[PDB]
Design an enzyme around this catalytic site. Structure first.
Site, PDB file in Angstrom:
ATOM      1  N   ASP A  34      82.069 118.906  80.286  1.00 23.85           N
ATOM      2  CA  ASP A  34      83.395 119.198  80.797  1.00 23.85           C
ATOM      3  C   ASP A  34      84.432 119.230  79.696  1.00 23.85           C
ATOM      4  O   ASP A  34      84.860 118.192  79.213  1.00 23.85           O
ATOM      5  CB  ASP A  34      83.787 118.172  81.851  1.00 23.85           C
ATOM      6  CG  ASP A  34      85.130 118.465  82.474  1.00 23.85           C
ATOM      7  OD1 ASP A  34      85.706 119.531  82.193  1.00 23.85           O
ATOM      8  OD2 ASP A  34      85.610 117.631  83.263  1.00 23.85           O
ATOM      9  N   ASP A 230      88.036 125.526  80.149  1.00 22.31           N
ATOM     10  CA  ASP A 230      87.510 124.407  80.921  1.00 22.31           C
ATOM     11  C   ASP A 230      86.125 124.701  81.528  1.00 22.31           C
ATOM     12  O   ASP A 230      86.006 125.437  82.510  1.00 22.31           O
ATOM     13  CB  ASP A 230      88.559 124.040  81.989  1.00 22.31           C
ATOM     14  CG  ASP A 230      88.146 122.893  82.891  1.00 22.31           C
ATOM     15  OD1 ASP A 230      87.128 122.210  82.644  1.00 22.31           O
ATOM     16  OD2 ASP A 230      88.881 122.676  83.874  1.00 22.31           O
TER      17      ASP A 230
HETATM   18  C1  LIG Z   1      91.710 115.022  83.203  1.00 20.88           C
HETATM   19  C2  LIG Z   1      91.653 115.251  84.718  1.00 20.88           C
HETATM   20  C3  LIG Z   1      92.382 116.539  85.139  1.00 20.88           C
HETATM   21  O1  LIG Z   1      91.584 117.664  84.731  1.00 20.88           O
HETATM   22  C4  LIG Z   1      91.549 118.789  85.612  1.00 20.88           C
HETATM   23  C5  LIG Z   1      91.425 120.036  84.744  1.00 20.88           C
HETATM   24  N1  LIG Z   1      89.983 120.023  84.339  1.00 20.88           N
HETATM   25  C6  LIG Z   1      89.309 119.825  85.660  1.00 20.88           C
HETATM   26  C7  LIG Z   1      87.853 119.349  85.477  1.00 20.88           C
HETATM   27  O2  LIG Z   1      87.851 118.265  84.543  1.00 20.88           O
HETATM   28  C8  LIG Z   1      87.127 118.951  86.785  1.00 20.88           C
HETATM   29  C9  LIG Z   1      85.698 118.459  86.473  1.00 20.88           C
HETATM   30  C10 LIG Z   1      84.871 118.092  87.697  1.00 20.88           C
HETATM   31  C11 LIG Z   1      83.570 118.558  87.864  1.00 20.88           C
HETATM   32  C12 LIG Z   1      82.819 118.211  89.000  1.00 20.88           C
HETATM   33  F1  LIG Z   1      81.562 118.671  89.162  1.00 20.88           F
HETATM   34  C13 LIG Z   1      83.359 117.381  89.980  1.00 20.88           C
HETATM   35  C14 LIG Z   1      84.655 116.925  89.813  1.00 20.88           C
HETATM   36  F2  LIG Z   1      85.195 116.131  90.738  1.00 20.88           F
HETATM   37  C15 LIG Z   1      85.396 117.272  88.691  1.00 20.88           C
HETATM   38  N2  LIG Z   1      87.065 120.105  87.685  1.00 20.88           N
HETATM   39  C16 LIG Z   1      87.799 120.170  88.816  1.00 20.88           C
HETATM   40  O3  LIG Z   1      88.548 119.257  89.113  1.00 20.88           O
HETATM   41  C17 LIG Z   1      87.671 121.386  89.700  1.00 20.88           C
HETATM   42  C18 LIG Z   1      88.632 121.395  90.884  1.00 20.88           C
HETATM   43  C19 LIG Z   1      88.688 122.804  91.483  1.00 20.88           C
HETATM   44  C20 LIG Z   1      89.427 122.824  92.796  1.00 20.88           C
HETATM   45  C21 LIG Z   1      90.799 123.091  92.800  1.00 20.88           C
HETATM   46  C22 LIG Z   1      91.518 123.126  93.996  1.00 20.88           C
HETATM   47  C23 LIG Z   1      90.846 122.884  95.194  1.00 20.88           C
HETATM   48  C24 LIG Z   1      89.465 122.612  95.188  1.00 20.88           C
HETATM   49  C25 LIG Z   1      88.746 122.583  93.987  1.00 20.88           C
HETATM   50  N3  LIG Z   1      86.278 121.486  90.122  1.00 20.88           N
HETATM   51  C26 LIG Z   1      85.515 120.386  90.734  1.00 20.88           C
HETATM   52  C27 LIG Z   1      84.286 121.022  91.389  1.00 20.88           C
HETATM   53  C28 LIG Z   1      84.115 122.256  90.494  1.00 20.88           C
HETATM   54  C29 LIG Z   1      83.311 121.727  89.300  1.00 20.88           C
HETATM   55  C30 LIG Z   1      81.971 122.343  88.918  1.00 20.88           C
HETATM   56  C31 LIG Z   1      81.566 121.682  87.594  1.00 20.88           C
HETATM   57  C32 LIG Z   1      80.906 121.989  89.948  1.00 20.88           C
HETATM   58  N4  LIG Z   1      83.498 123.341  91.280  1.00 20.88           N
HETATM   59  C33 LIG Z   1      84.033 123.974  92.345  1.00 20.88           C
HETATM   60  C34 LIG Z   1      83.230 125.058  93.025  1.00 20.88           C
HETATM   61  O4  LIG Z   1      85.136 123.737  92.812  1.00 20.88           O
HETATM   62  C35 LIG Z   1      85.499 122.568  89.995  1.00 20.88           C
HETATM   63  O5  LIG Z   1      85.841 123.620  89.504  1.00 20.88           O
HETATM   64  C36 LIG Z   1      90.223 118.808  86.374  1.00 20.88           C
END
Ligand SMILES: CCCO[C@H]1CN[C@@H]([C@@H](O)[C@H](Cc2cc(F)cc(F)c2)NC(=O)[C@H](CCc2ccccc2)N2CC[C@@](CC(C)C)(NC(C)=O)C2=O)C1
Length: 386
Positions: A34, A230
């Protein structure tokens, strides 16, 4: 870096992970890569979605820091207990490092069923680490305690079709090269955009095109709040004002077929009969990025093959189905894994820049290709940041 190549597995929708060992004797765990966070955290208690976890009581080198830690992501949060331990990457540099580990005790919508990873490796900078910037992120620890150069590079490689867990376990998902650049992972030249600020991996987008057509917005809107590279995000996420103009442009170009509103909101799949996906009706998307040279920029171009994310059919039929993987953001642009799938991406921390070249692994057809091209003498620039 032959020993480093093909060390990733996973997919955009479930994440790309690397094998690491923690503790003494070494405990093997798959860790989500990540670049959009800075905490190194692993499951330390039983969970339905976890087939294994970190057991501190079984590690002789574990150090308890007697501190709690909470990380809220955009969707998802975990809670944990801070500690240190020895850490290794079996298909990474031949080194062992003592790192901060958040041992995860409580979890809400963090872990993903079938994903096959048990922790998260935050590759970003200390500034966004929890509890605070005093907790040294893994990559900082690695560089300080070893002779590994201050850079890493990512090749995220999407299949262009749905992969089952059997296939995702057997398939090579890409390469994370720590300390170097591997010339076999890209074609053409590498173009560098500056890291604006060392917190997230922050960049500036100067211009946006859809099938060559300028969306024609003030460049500050493209980076409203911020823009980041990201790997921990599946989608290309766009500030609402940008998102709405983009969806309208994409809709207008893809007009010869009509799609439900829920496809465009990223919620519903669309299927075509096998092999008949009409890629040609969908536009390419170009993001222009600030160059290292003053008043210079370059562009990265992705295909519908990057922004239509393959999903398995409701009845698992022979149809080719996809979700629209561009979505709305209230916290700036997230250049996520589906965009990253197009390119080899160099995080050159030493020289404060991010490199882009066309991925040798990118999905395309015989008619169109992903591109990294420049330079363009675009004007304005300089107050594109927020
Ligand atoms: C320092 C903290 C602030 O940093 C922010 C900026 N960087 C971001 C990442 O660090 C974080 C990592 C992470 C990975 C993971 F698996 C699980 C987590 F909970 C976190 N990702 C996210 O939060 C988004 C939210 C999207 C979103 C935005 C709005 C609404 C719904 C979802 N997610 C989570 C799921 C994922 C991830 C995929 C790897 C499976 N897939 C899909 C289909 O949604 C994705 O895109 C956070």
């Amino acid at each position: 870096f032959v020993e480093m190549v093909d060390n990733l597995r996973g997919k955009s929708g479930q994440g790309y992970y690397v094998e690491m060992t923690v503790g003494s004797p070494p405990q093997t765990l798959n860790i989500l890569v990540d670049t959009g966070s800075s905490n190194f955290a692993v499951g330390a208690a039983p969970h339905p979605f976890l087939h294994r976890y970190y057991q501190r009581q079984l590690s002789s080198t574990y150090r308890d820091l007697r501190k709690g830690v909470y990380v809220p992501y955009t969707q998802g949060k975990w809670e944990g207990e801070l500690g240190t331990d020895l850490v290794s990457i079996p298909h990474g540099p031949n080194v062992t490092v003592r790192a901060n580990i958040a041992a995860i005790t409580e979890s809400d919508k963090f872990f993903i069923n079938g994903s096959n990873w048990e922790g998260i490796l935050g590759l970003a900078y200390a500034e966004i680490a929890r509890p605070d910037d005093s907790l040294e992120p893994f990559f900082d620890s690695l560089v300080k305690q070893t002779h590994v150069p201050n850079l890493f590079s990512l090749q995220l490689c999407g299949a262009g079709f749905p992969l089952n867990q059997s296939e995702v376990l057997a398939s090579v998902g890409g390469s994370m090269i720590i300390g170097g650049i591997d010339h076999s992972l890209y074609t053409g030249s590498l173009w560098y955009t500056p890291i604006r600020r060392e917190w997230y991996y922050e960049v500036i987008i100067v211009r946006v095109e859809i099938n060559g057509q300028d969306l024609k917005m003030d460049c500050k809107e493209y980076n409203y709040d911020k823009s980041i590279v990201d790997s921990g995000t599946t989608n290309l996420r766009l500030p609402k004002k940008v998102f709405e103009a983009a969806v309208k442009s994409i809709k207008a170009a893809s007009s010869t077929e009509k799609f439900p509103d829920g496809f465009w909101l990223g919620e519903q799949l669309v299927c075509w009969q096998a092999g008949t996906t009409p890629w040609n009706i969908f536009p390419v998307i170009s993001l222009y990025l600030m160059g290292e040279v003053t008043n210079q920029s370059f562009r990265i171009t992705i295909l519908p093959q990057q922004y239509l994310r393959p999903v398995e059919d409701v009845a698992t039929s022979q149809d080719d189905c996809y979700k629209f993987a561009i979505s709305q953001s209230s916290t700036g642009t997230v250049m996520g894994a589906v965009i990253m799938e197009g390119f080899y991406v160099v995080f050159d921390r030493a020289r404060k820049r991010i490199g882009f070249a066309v991925s040798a692994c990118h999905v395309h057809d015989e008619f169109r290709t992903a591109a990294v091209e420049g330079p363009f003498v675009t004007l304005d620039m300089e107050d594109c940041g927020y």
